[PDB]
C-alpha cells in the first residue's frame, strides 16, 4: 500500500508487499513507439526481442532469473523476475546487459535470427489478430501524422529495412538516465534496493536529453480495411479521450464502465445492468463489444470496439450504441453512475493488485514517469466515489456531444455506413 520513490543520481521507485513469493526488478524508459519515426518504426519492439533472445535469456535462466519486456506508446520496459533472495543478482544481469553487453547482444548472427522472428511475429498479427489489428489502426487514423499514430510492433516495411545502427542510434538517444526510472516490485524494501544501486557508481551518458517533437492531435477520420473473406466484422470507434493526469481521467473511465463490455455467449453477461443490452439482444447485433478509456501522455481515446456476424444489421449496432452514448449528456441516471462506480473499483482493484509483480512494475513505472508519483488505490476510490451525474454530463457534453469520431474496421464491413451517418448520431434533434 506504500509508494516509495527517491532520487540520488537515478530515480528509484518501489512498492513492497511481503506476502509476495517473488520480486521483480527492471528499468522503465520514458520513451516508446510514440518517440519513433515512420521510418525506424519498430526499433523499440526489436530491442525488446533481443533482450529476450535465446542467448541473453539462457544466461538469466542458469542464474534462475526470468525475463520480461513491454513496448508501449509513451514508455518502454525491461524486467527481470527472481526470488526475494536473489534481488541482487537481478541488478547484475540488468547492468551486464545495458552496459557490458550493449554490444554483445547486437551481433550479426543474433540480430538476423531475431529480425526474422519479429517479422514472422508482426506478420502473424496483421494476418490474424483482427480485433487488436483494428484497434491499432484506430490509433493510426485518429492520430495520423502525429506520435500516437505509430503502431507499437512497428510496420513490416520499416522493420525489414532496419539495421544494427538504428538500434544503437535509438538506444543512445532514449536509453538515457534522465529518461529512465528503475522500478522494483515484489517484496523487497525500498532501502534494500536503493543501496545496491547507490553502491555501484558510474553515470554513463549523464546530462544527455532525448530529442523533442510535435504535440499529438486527434483528427476525426476513418480507415476501412474491408475483407469479405473474413467471417465477421470487427470495428472500433472513438472520440478524443483524456490524457493521463487529466481532471476528468476518472470521469472518462467511469463513463466507459456504464456501457462496459459484453459477450453474447456468456449467460451472466446478457444479464448486466446495461440499457444498451435491451436493444442489441433482440436481433443479436453482435457477438461482443467493450468500451474503453485509453489514456496517454498527450491525449487519449474514448469509445468502443465490437465484433459481429450479423453483417446486414451493423447499422443498428452502431445506431443503438451511439444513442446510448447520447444519454450521458442528457439523461444518465443516478443508479447507472452508482453501478459504474462499484464496477470501476472492482476492475481498478483487480489491475493494481494482481498476483503478479511484473504487472505491478509496468503500472508503477508508467505512472511515475509521467507525474513523478503514483496515486494510491485508496486515493483513486475517493475520487471515483466523488463523481456526480452532473460531472458525467459536463464531461460528455464536451467530449461526446456533436464531436468528431475516428473509425476503423476490417472483415465484412459493407454494412458499416458512411462517416457522416455515424457522425450525425453523435447527437439528437431538439426543439
Amino acid at each position: 500500500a506504500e509508494v516509495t520513490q527517491l532520487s540520488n543520481g537515478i530515480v528509484v521507485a518501489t512498492e513492497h508487499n511481503p506476502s509476495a513469493h517473488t520480486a521483480s526488478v527492471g528499468v522503465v524508459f520514458g520513451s516508446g513507439a510514440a518517440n519513433e519515426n515512420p521510418y525506424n518504426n519498430g526499433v523499440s519492439n526489436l530491442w525488446k526481442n533481443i533482450f529476450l533472445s535465446k542467448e541473453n535469456s539462457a544466461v538469466a535462466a542458469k542464474e534462475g532469473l526470468a525475463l520480461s519486456s513491454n513496448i508501449s506508446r509513451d514508455f518502454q520496459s525491461y524486467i527481470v523476475s527472481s526470488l526475494p533472495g536473489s534481488t541482487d543478482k537481478s541488478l547484475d544481469f540488468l547492468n551486464q546487459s545495458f552496459i557490458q553487453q550493449k554490444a554483445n547482444l547486437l551481433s550479426s548472427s543474433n540480430f538476423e535470427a531475431t529480425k526474422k522472428s519479429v517479422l514472422k511475429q508482426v506478420q502473424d498479427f496483421e494476418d490474424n489478430d483482427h480485433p487488436n489489428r483494428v484497434l491499432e489502426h484506430l490509433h493510426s487514423t485518429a492520430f495520423q501524422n502525429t506520435p500516437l499514430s505509430l503502431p507499437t510492433r512497428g510496420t513490416l516495411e520499416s522493420l525489414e529495412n532496419l539495421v544494427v545502427a538504428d538500434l544503437e542510434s535509438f538506444a543512445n538517444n532514449h536509453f538515457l538516465n534522465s529518461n529512465a526510472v528503475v522500478v522494483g516490485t515484489g517484496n523487497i524494501k525500498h532501502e534494500d534496493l536503493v543501496n545496491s544501486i547507490e553502491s555501484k557508481n558510474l553515470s554513463l551518458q549523464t546530462g544527455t536529453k532525448p530529442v523533442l517533437k510535435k504535440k499529438a492531435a486527434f483528427l476525426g477520420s476513418e480507415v476501412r480495411l474491408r475483407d469479405d473473406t473474413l467471417p465477421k466484422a470487427w470495428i472500433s470507434l472513438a472520440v478524443e479521450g483524456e490524457p493521463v493526469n487529466s481532471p476528468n481521467y476518472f470521469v472518462a473511465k467511469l463513463a466507459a464502465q456504464i456501457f462496459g463490455s459484453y459477450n453474447a455467449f456468456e449467460p451472466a453477461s446478457r444479464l448486466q445492468g446495461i440499457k444498451l443490452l435491451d436493444n442489441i439482444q433482440e436481433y443479436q447485433l453482435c457477438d461482443n463489444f467493450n468500451h474503453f478509456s485509453l489514456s496517454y501522455k498527450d491525449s487519449g481515446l474514448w469509445g468502443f470496439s465490437t465484433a459481429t456476424r450479423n453483417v446486414t444489421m451493423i447499422d443498428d449496432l452502431i445506431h443503438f450504441t451511439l444513442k446510448q452514448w447520447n444519454r450521458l449528456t442528457i439523461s444518465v441516471t443516478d443508479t447507472e453512475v452508482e453501478r459504474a462506480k462499484s464496477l470501476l473499483k472492482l476492475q481498478l482493484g483487480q489491475l493494481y493488485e494482481s498476483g503478479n509483480p511484473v504487472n505491478d512494475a509496468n503500472l508503477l513505472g508508467a505512472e511515475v514517469l509521467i507525474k513523478g508519483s503514483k496515486l494510491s488505490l485508496g486515493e483513486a476510490f475517493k475520487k471515483i466515489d466523488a463523481i456526480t451525474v452532473k460531472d458525467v454530463k459536463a464531461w460528455a457534453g464536451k467530449r461526446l456531444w456533436d464531436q468528431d469520431i475516428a473509425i476503423a474496421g476490417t472483415g465484412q464491413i459493407e454494412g458499416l455506413l458512411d462517416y457522416m451517418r455515424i457522425r450525425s448520431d453523435m447527437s439528437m434533434m431538439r426543439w
Binding site: 489502426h137 503502431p151 510496420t155 520499416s158 483528427l219 480495411l225
Partner: protein
C-alpha cells in the same frame, strides 16, 4: 504499401488554429437555409390559403 501509413490530406486539411472554424460556417449556413425555408414555406402556405378567402367581386356592400 503499409495500411498504417495514412495518405496525404494536407491539401484538404485546414491548419487547425481555430478548431471550430468549419463547424461555425456549416452551422451558420445550415441555420440560414433553415430560416429562409421556413419563411418561404409560410409564405407559400398563406398564398394558397388566402386564395380561398372571399373574392374581390363578391364583397358587395348592400
Amino acid at each position: 504499401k503499409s495500411t498504417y501509413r495514412t495518405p496525404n490530406f494536407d491539401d484538404v486539411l485546414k491548419e487547425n488554429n481555430d478548431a471550430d472554424k468549419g463547424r461555425s460556417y456549416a452551422y451558420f449556413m445550415v441555420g440560414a437555409m433553415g430560416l429562409l425555408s421556413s419563411a418561404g414555406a409560410k409564405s407559400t402556405v398563406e398564398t394558397f390559403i388566402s386564395s380561398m378567402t372571399a373574392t374581390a367581386d363578391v364583397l358587395a356592400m348592400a
